[PDB]
């Protein structure tokens, strides 16, 4: 079959080691990357906010919040995400590029609920979610992108957000 075929990198702008890298906010079994306060337009051009999710335990809910275009006036005018089918389709490193790949084929036993919580599990609804299996044998890393670097508000520019989900063997 087929589920898309694109190619991105960690950037598409500038910076490579000036990346603001932080861990996800982990509450019990919920690991959250919330970009609703990281991607607003700022004077120092486009920053890159890299949220690192490290899964070392069974049945972790990974939740990702991306500010919706138009949710506030202006600040998210040109916001777009990496994989449009973000829960079911992810990005994987191939040397220097990130290409699309089905998540269920990457990790066996992925429980993708079609209804996140009364809404459609898709970045169009602002939030995606997926639960990791009880057993993972090989370390697997996949990526998500919430890019607001195109949005221009004032004399500053928005930021590009990166989620790195590192599923460790557990």
């Amino acid at each position, epitope marked *: 079959d087929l589920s898309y075929e694109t190619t991105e990198s960690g950037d598409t702008a500038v910076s490579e080691d000036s990346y*603001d*890298k*932080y*861990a*996800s*906010q*982990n*509450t019990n079994k919920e690991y959250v990357c*919330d970009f*609703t*306060d*990281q991607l*607003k337009p*700022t*004077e*120092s051009g486009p920053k890159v*906010k890299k*949220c690192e999710v490290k899964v070392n335990e069974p049945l972790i809910k990974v939740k990702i919040i991306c500010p919706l275009k138009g949710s*506030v*006036e*202006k*600040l998210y005018d040109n916001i777009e995400y990496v994989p449009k089918k973000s829960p079911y389709v992810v990005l994987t490193k191939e040397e220097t590029k990130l290409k699309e790949k089905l998540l269920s084929k990457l990790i066996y036993g992925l429980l993708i609920s079609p209804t996140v919580n009364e809404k459609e599990n898709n970045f169009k609804e602002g939030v995606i979610e997926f639960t990791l299996p009880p057993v993972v044998h090989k370390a697997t890393v996949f990526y998500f992108i919430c890019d607001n670097s195109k949005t221009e508000d004032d004399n500053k520019k928005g930021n590009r957000g990166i989620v790195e989900v590192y599923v460790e063997p557990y």
Partner: antibody
Amino acid sequence: QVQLQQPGAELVKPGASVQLSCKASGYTFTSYWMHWVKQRPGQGLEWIGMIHPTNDKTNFNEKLKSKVTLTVDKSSTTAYMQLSSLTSEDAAVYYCARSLSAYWYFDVWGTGTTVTVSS
Amino acid sequence: DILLTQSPAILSVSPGERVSFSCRASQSIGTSIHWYQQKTQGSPRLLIKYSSESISGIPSRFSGSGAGTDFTLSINSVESEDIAVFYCQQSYTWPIFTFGSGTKLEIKR
């Protein structure tokens, strides 16, 4: 020319209410949140709440919401904080401050009203 | 709950040295930290927005940094006019905001 003007003092009797005022000037009032910050004599800043002038949308820290009411008069670009049933614990300096849109920092702060609760 | 910790309560340098105030969050909050300066009997003054962005009229010797949990406001070549209390503020829990307990900066000649 941005200005947030606050009265110097308010002497309140125990159990009475007080109306604090924050007169804004020199900017577009309807484009900014107006926050209220409490500072007891020699201590730290304590965020209380905020209000947006257009929709009258208010957000409070639920620990102090029971006693606070926030109000805006768009005609005179003035923000008000109502405080009820005051006690000695309510005596402090109360600053107003503004924040633009969803940029959640306080760039312009008011002069501050020293509130005293005594008979 | 997100909790901020500023240590120590009192920091002392020398006129010209490098000062740095620590603001630690109890959970990772990206770059949702903001710094303020309050001088004696004065209103707080915004020094740094979103961890490391300079403000319009702040001297260039005021710099912040940090992502996630540990944030640092630094002053290279500290003057004596910088004597005040420094508060950090988090916005990750918007629309609820909190301040750190503040770190006082003194100078000893």
